């Protein structure tokens, strides 16, 4: 009869699944931050490529 140590283990598993969700939330917020920074870098490099290519023609 291990019915008691099964419930303990299920608390532990349920405890960890909670922590998991908390991690998913936070790193959701980090991806969001990094995607916004990436859009700024992408623009700025494009401008440089533009201004830079305008230099060519002349």
């Amino acid at each position: 009869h291990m019915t008691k140590q099964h419930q303990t283990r299920l608390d532990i598993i349920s405890e960890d699944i909670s922590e998991l969700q908390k991690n998913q939330t936070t790193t959701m917020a980090k991806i969001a931050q990094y995607k916004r920074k990436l859009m700024d870098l992408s623009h700025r490099t494009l401008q440089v490529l533009i201004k830079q290519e305008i230099q060519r023609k002349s």
Binding site: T3, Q7, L38
Partner: protein, 54 residues
């Protein structure tokens, strides 16, 4: 048997979805990750050439 067998049997199924749900939210997070490492290795490729030239 205390009916504790019922609670465990119940938690099992509950925890089952949780993980399955969570495994999904993860798959979606991993996808956001590659798209970044992708557009980013592509931004550094466009810049590496014209850096030591300007």
């Amino acid at each position: 048997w205390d009916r504790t067998l019922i609670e465990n049997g119940e938690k099992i199924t509950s925890l089952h979805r949780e993980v399955e749900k969570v495994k999904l939210d993860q798959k979606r997070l991993d996808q956001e990750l590659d798209f970044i490492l992708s557009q980013q290795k592509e931004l550094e490729d466009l810049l590496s050439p014209l850096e030591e030239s300007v």
